[PDB]
Swiss-Prot record, chain A:
GO terms for cellular component: cytosolic large ribosomal subunit. This is Large ribosomal subunit protein bL35. The keyword DNA-binding does not apply. It comes from Deinococcus radiodurans (strain ATCC 13939 / DSM 20539 / JCM 16871 / CCUG 27074 / LMG 4051 / NBRC 15346 / NCIMB 9279 / VKM B-1422 / R1). One of its GO terms (biological process) is translation.
Swiss-Prot record, chain B:
Binds the 23S rRNA and the E site tRNA. This is Large ribosomal subunit protein bL33. Keywords: Ribonucleoprotein, Ribosomal protein, RNA-binding, rRNA-binding, tRNA-binding. SUPFAM superfamilies: Zn-binding ribosomal proteins. GO terms for molecular function: rRNA binding; structural constituent of ribosome; tRNA binding. Belongs to the bacterial ribosomal protein bL33 family.
UniProtKB/Swiss-Prot annotation, chain C:
GO terms for biological process: translation. Binds the 5S and 23S rRNAs and also the tRNA in the P site. It comes from the Bacteria. The keyword rRNA-binding applies. Belongs to the bacterial ribosomal protein bL27 family. Part of the 50S ribosomal subunit. Contacts protein L18. Coiled coil: none annotated. This is Large ribosomal subunit protein bL27. Keywords: Ribonucleoprotein, Ribosomal protein, RNA-binding, rRNA-binding, tRNA-binding. The lineage of its organism: Bacteria, Thermotogati, Deinococcota, Deinococci, Deinococcales.
Length: 65, 54, 84
RNA sequence: CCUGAGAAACUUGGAUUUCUAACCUGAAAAAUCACUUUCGGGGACCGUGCUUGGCGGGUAGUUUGACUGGGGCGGUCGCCUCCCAAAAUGUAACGGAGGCGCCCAAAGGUCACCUCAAGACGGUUGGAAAUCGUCUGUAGAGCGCAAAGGUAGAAGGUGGCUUGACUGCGAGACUGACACGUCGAGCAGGGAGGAAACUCGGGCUUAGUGAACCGGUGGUACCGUGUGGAAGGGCCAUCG
RNA sequence: GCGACUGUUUACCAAAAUCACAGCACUCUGCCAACACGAACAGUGGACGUAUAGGGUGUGACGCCUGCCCGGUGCCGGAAGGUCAAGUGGAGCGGUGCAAGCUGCGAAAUGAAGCCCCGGUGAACGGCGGCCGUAACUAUAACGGUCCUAAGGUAGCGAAAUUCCUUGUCGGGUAAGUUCCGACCUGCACGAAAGGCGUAACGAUCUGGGCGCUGUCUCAACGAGGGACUCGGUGAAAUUGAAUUGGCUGUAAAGAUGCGGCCUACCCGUAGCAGGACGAAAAGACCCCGUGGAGCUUUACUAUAGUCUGGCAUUGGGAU
RNA sequence: GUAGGGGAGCGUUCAGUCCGCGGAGAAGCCAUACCGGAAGGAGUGGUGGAGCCGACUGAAGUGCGGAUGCCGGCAUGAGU
RNA sequence: AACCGAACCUGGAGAUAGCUAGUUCUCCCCGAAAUGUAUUGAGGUACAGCCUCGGAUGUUGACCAUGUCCUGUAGAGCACUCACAAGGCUAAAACCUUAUGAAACUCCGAAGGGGCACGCGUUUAGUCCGGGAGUGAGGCUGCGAGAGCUAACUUCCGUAGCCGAGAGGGAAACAACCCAGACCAUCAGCUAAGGUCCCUAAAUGAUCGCUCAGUGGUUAA
RNA sequence: UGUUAUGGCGUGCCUAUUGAAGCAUGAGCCGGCGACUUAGACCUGACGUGCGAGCUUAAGUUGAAAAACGGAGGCGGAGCGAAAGCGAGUCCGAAUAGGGCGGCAUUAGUACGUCGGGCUAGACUCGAAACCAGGUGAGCUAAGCAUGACCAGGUUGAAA
RNA sequence: GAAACGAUGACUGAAUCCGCGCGGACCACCGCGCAAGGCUAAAUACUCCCAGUGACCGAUAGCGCAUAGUACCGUGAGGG
RNA sequence: UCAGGGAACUGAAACAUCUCAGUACCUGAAGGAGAAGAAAGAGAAUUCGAUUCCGUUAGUAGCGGCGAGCGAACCCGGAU
């Protein structure tokens, strides 16, 4: 039947043009007062994964969204 | 951090501006015992001076 | 009878590797930003063209080629010089 | 119309006390029953219906880590340093030593200035060692703690002013299977010390840490369901 | 030695020291009795019984007896206070429309049992214990005994069904006794109804010694009967890679008839032996592994029958 | 050359279609010294008694020595 | 109601089974892995590493010389650090002559090793993108070390080769050792390790010797 | 070609493994049955094909010894953000400097089919110990209840 | 969970037209609606049975059965 | 087919919410079918207009130890 979209992922991973998958950087809830400044700033953001651990994500969603 | 630690308590620095802002650091409390007066930036303008908020 | 021991150990401890040593050697190129050496201290002294982060890492301020010198045994720097 | 109050009256309740026509219960020519009556007593309590918390191995479902010269016992489980590691990085062992889960409002930024451990002689308390003096004096010291590397043209010791222990970023690289992690010129807003060139987005460095999730809090006005509002939610911050 | 006794028990490896018992003891229970089966206000056992009765629990005839600790747990009782749920009460907060207003949230005080707390309770749970130093090499046969939790063993027993050291020391029996009996006491680690110590009698119990008798034995013999063997009749089995299946030394996954070398050995069978074929039988029941299972246990987690408890409905009048 | 990925094919049935055989004898079975690189496939002889080969294409319950495999038959042990 | 710590029958039901077995036609080409990192994970799964197919690319691979920087082992040394042999000398500590040991000593310090460049001279691979995997138990000798007892068919790393996945000759026999990588055919030739009295192919060879012990054909103070 | 003597040579097969003739697993023999599949209009790929900045139907309808109709929806068309929104741009920010994107120095999709993989369902076949529901059993055994039955002969010698 | 609405077990049990109910807390606005009374063919599901077909089986296949729930086992359910 | 009752193994690589699944089973009633049905409705266009069925929206909106996994409807096309 229709392969389910992993709602596990509908707020944490992203497709694109090239097909590459992006996600965010980690450590922004109690990894705080640490800090450092470029850490706290670095972590709010977003980023493309490596490769190897790409396809999995893809298969988490068919629509790409 | 480590809860039942009384020295080096983690407390924040609220601006005298009222911008809606706060920094966050750690005084030994075997030191200040009153408050803290620091001079950091503030995105919502430029250069405030901060009171060590409760 | 047989054996009951009972001894334990108190060591068996170490720390995961710190990849030190000179990363970019002598006579090879570079790009700007490129790290040329990691070290614990001033095993290698900031020379003309090179900068020193908090780690005492040696990084390149602009491109070109890499120049090593030891000053007769115990004092030593790396510098940069372009392709001209 | 009343500040305080007295009779009456509606009383709406709280308690005990009592009464019985609910309801429970027994006996009498009709056994379980149902009449009818003496009714005998019980009596708004019990019992039962819904919710409230407690108790509850009586019953019911489960959990009970791993390494490991078998398993158990004991020991170990993350991070740092040093050998082992065969002159590149890397590398096991229940191999050989030791350390961290903080500390610092100055021990940080800048500016300026000072030089160390000891031994010899000689010196009031002292007299092995205290304080002062001179000759020696590249490290035989010091760095908040672990050691290694590092350091005297200072990172060591002392003062002036100070909040770069700063938002918006990130050229380029180190590193890791991934996730992480590490260094960083330079640009902007805006500062700090210097007279300046400058230097600074924490400390000589490498330990001083915990991903998600759910929630607290300070902003923010992106979402808010016929519509405009508010709950709630998102984003930055952050706390457990 | 153990139990008192007659009895009972693991159908198919345990018959006893198990269990039951008469006896005693603690508690519980006043009748629609507790307690128990139960869709359940049914109906039933308890019981057509009534505290000289009924339940539950423990010890286990009888005889002399049954001590010391109430701090923890349990249980019985106590009440000043700490308290605690829903409900009662809502000051105050805010959302909204111009609004009468609808509404989101929600604090004081009050408020059930129960726990905290105070005391009592052992024929309730239980408790009735740590230690001191010795000449030498980092040590062995041995020491006499002062004693922290609530107390730290009264009688009786004690090398025992209990004893680590262990064949303890002594005595008896024996020619000789790790066993047994008596005493001893340094009880690793007896002890009073989880009974203590005794005891006639009882026992297909257990333990040692004796007399008697004996092929149990020295040491086996002869005999008998039923098999085994032979012939005619009927004729299974488990096993089985396939075999044309020796021995010694060696090698090989380390226990070789199969490889090496060397020895020995003509083909077949019959009655017999049990060394080998790691012989057959059951994918080991021990051991490790499995984020396998089931039984059981508790102050591991979560519920929950049941049960206590406040409010609500059945549910009413009145007197103060 | 083991796990593994790739390449080309052999055989079995059912099916569409064509070549076509068969009581002067089909399939199946039995023997053999032929052919193909192999899965395989031909010649002839004996069996049998009424159906079948070949090419191309399609679809599969499509190829067994193992599973202490399942059903059945017959061996060993034994003239014990 | 012939095996009760939870009857038997039917059913959910083909529960699950990180476990054990088993998994059939043929030829050809390539051809591994038992390492890392996590894991209520350790005989299991993820990602890399390694195989294979195919599309891109163009010699980027590979060995080897050169050039060039990085290093702190082997040895060595005593200059700090702990150790320690004799002697001086003083009031012993220092310090002098003489003297030595070191994984966690280093005035010194190779052989090698690695990065970059060049290709000055050879050879073939490399790298990317996309499909399919399997493997994640390793084993032995040689050289390096640790734990051991300078024990082990011992164990835990490193490193080369081999078996694993390797037939063929040799080592009597013998995964690992020495030679060597089997596309078929041949009643054809040369060699390797290893051999040449007979078993058993091939000199009972040649010359200079040794041992007389059956050493050879298993050990030491 | 069948058989044979003599020679040389030669460690059954499978599975499991660091390593099998193994004294390690399996199996007496021969037959026959016996295991990598199916589904979905899911996912992603390789080959192929038909149309090609375009490609395509599903349910159904009608006819049916055949197939045609059926645009409802699907895939492509534009990205970027948390989202509003902006759009060959967008986002963070106050702009810079950047991630994603378009151009790019260039390139095509879609529907069918065959196949290599994927997911959800038994998913290669066989194998549990167990777990739950509904029922069947006291003609065995454990006992209860009502009712009948049964114990040669002998010894001992209590109360009264 | 911001928990709307329906739905009922126990307590409470409002308005009837200038009224009632909903629009996912809640408020106004603005929209969709007539609770407390009933029946209803049609398309849809199944297939003991009847018929037609088949790239379904032909005697270990196919239902368990070329027939039989019989022989046989089981006290029984049930297996077969 | 409707209703009263309502499991577990399993999966989440352990389990308890959760998933298995209102599935297996038990029961009640009834028919040739049944159920449902004539709006206090969907809803967002001031649009549709009893139900049941299929296609589709759509693995989209959402649910969830936000883990495993669970998963609509309005519109649009048909059946009637
Ligand atoms: Mg339990
Ligand atoms: Mg373990
Ligand atoms: Mg090296
Ligand atoms: Mg390793
Ligand atoms: Mg979670
Ligand atoms: Mg907030
Ligand atoms: Mg808000
Ligand atoms: Mg007795
Ligand atoms: Mg018995
Ligand atoms: Mg017996
Ligand atoms: Mg009370
Ligand atoms: Mg004696
Ligand atoms: Mg007794
Ligand atoms: Mg008796
Ligand atoms: Mg005797
Ligand atoms: Mg005979
Ligand atoms: Mg042989
Ligand atoms: Mg032999
Ligand atoms: Mg015999
Ligand atoms: Mg076994
Ligand atoms: Mg045909
Ligand atoms: Mg035929
Ligand atoms: Mg067979
Ligand atoms: Mg066998
Ligand atoms: Mg005979
Ligand atoms: Mg015989
Ligand atoms: Mg015989
Ligand atoms: Mg039985
Ligand atoms: Mg099931
Ligand atoms: Mg099964
Ligand atoms: Mg090859
Ligand atoms: Mg391993
Ligand atoms: Mg992989
Ligand atoms: Mg090259
Ligand atoms: Mg040395
Ligand atoms: Mg010199
Ligand atoms: Mg593993
Ligand atoms: Mg290894
Ligand atoms: Mg081993
Ligand atoms: Mg292998
Ligand atoms: Mg070989
Ligand atoms: Mg060989
Ligand atoms: Mg040989
Ligand atoms: Mg060997
Ligand atoms: Mg030669
Ligand atoms: Mg010869
Ligand atoms: Mg096989
Ligand atoms: Mg083995
Ligand atoms: Mg054999
Ligand atoms: Mg065998
Ligand atoms: Mg085995
Ligand atoms: Mg195509
Ligand atoms: Mg396709
Ligand atoms: Mg599959
Ligand atoms: Mg409601
Ligand atoms: Mg036949
Ligand atoms: Mg049949
Ligand atoms: Mg379960
Ligand atoms: Mg599970
Ligand atoms: Mg009926």
């Amino acid at each position: 039947p229709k392969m389910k979209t992993h709602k596990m992922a509908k707020r944490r991973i992203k497709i694109t043009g090239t097909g590459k998958v992006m996600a965010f950087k980690s450590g922004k809830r109690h990894q705080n007062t640490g800090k450092s400044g470029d850490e706290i700033r670095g972590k709010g953001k977003g980023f493309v994964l490596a490769k190897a651990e790409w396809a999995r994500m893809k298969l988490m969603l068919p629509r790409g969204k | 951090a480590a809860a039942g630690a009384a020295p080096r308590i983690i407390v924040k620095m609220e601006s005298s501006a009222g911008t809606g802002f706060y920094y966050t650091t750690t005084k030994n409390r075997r030191n200040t015992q009153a408050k803290l007066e620091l001079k950091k930036y503030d995105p919502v303008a430029a250069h405030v001076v901060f009171a060590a908020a409760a | 009878a047989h054996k009951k021991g009972v001894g334990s150990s108190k060591n068996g401890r170490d720390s995961n590797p710190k990849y030190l040593g000179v990363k970019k050697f002598g006579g090879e190129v570079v790009k700007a930003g490129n790290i040329l050496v990691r070290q614990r201290g001033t095993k290698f002294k900031a020379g003309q063209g090179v900068g020193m982060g908090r780690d005492h890492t040696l990084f390149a301020l602009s491109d070109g080629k890499v120049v090593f010198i030891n000053k007769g045994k115990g004092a030593r720097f790396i510098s940069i010089e372009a392709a001209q």
